[PDB]
Design a protein around this ligand. Sequence first.
Ligand SMILES: [Zn+2]
Length: 185
Amino acid sequence: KIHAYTEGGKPLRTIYLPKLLKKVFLDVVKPNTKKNLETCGILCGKLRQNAFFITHLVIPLQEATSDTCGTTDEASLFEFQDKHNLLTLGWIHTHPTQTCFMSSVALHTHCSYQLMLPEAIAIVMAPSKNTSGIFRLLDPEGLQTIVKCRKPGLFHPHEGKVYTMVAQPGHVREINSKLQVVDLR
Ligand SMILES: [Zn+2]
């Protein structure tokens, strides 16, 4: 039915995302959005038959401003995932006031995830704008740009096109399946 490919011609296995996830993530983190604070989550799941299914939304121990968010204890994130045999399939964070786009920070974070898993996706929610997006870096050219990048500075620019929206429903298909939310905060 569906074969998705990167810019470099490598095949991408399908990721099945619960349609409820986006909505549910906004629900659980709504208090921070109120206080104009970003929140991040991890999309976790399993590989069955050359396709990935997102089964858990994990909210890690974190810190945030209206501009940023970041994990503060990846050790217990690891232990949880290791204990329950859960793959890191991507991640999600909010833009309480902003438009829907991948920031410099997000691109640097996601680059590493996508190198470790070419299908890895970054979801960004913009509640205030009532828009959301599912993104990934161009592969190989965007990954290359961010890998070589050594600019200090949280909101610095990059030159050239670096990321793109994931094509749905080819790479990511939103379905009608279960979801556990694990809040580690
Ligand atoms: Zn950079």
